[PDB]
Amino acid sequence: KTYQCQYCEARSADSSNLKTHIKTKHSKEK
């Protein structure tokens, strides 16, 4: 149904959104 981060266990319904999340909460990818 949703997409969950490919680093942690976060869940989003869009892509741009999840990427944003990574940029600041992981700051390693992509």
In the complex, which residues of this chain contact Zn ion (CB under 5 A)?
Answer: 5, 7-8, 10
Q: Residues with Cβ < 8 Å from 28, sequence gap 6 or more? A: 7, 22
Least distance from C-beta 26 to Zn ion, angstroms? 5
Instruction: Give the residue at shortest CB distance from Zn ion.
Output: 5
Q: Give the CA distances from residue 25 to residues 1, 6, 14, in Å, rounded to whole numbers and listed in that order.
A: 23, 12, 17
CB of 17 to Zn ion, least distance (A): 11
> Smallest gap, in angstroms, from Cβ of residue 30 to Zn ion?
11
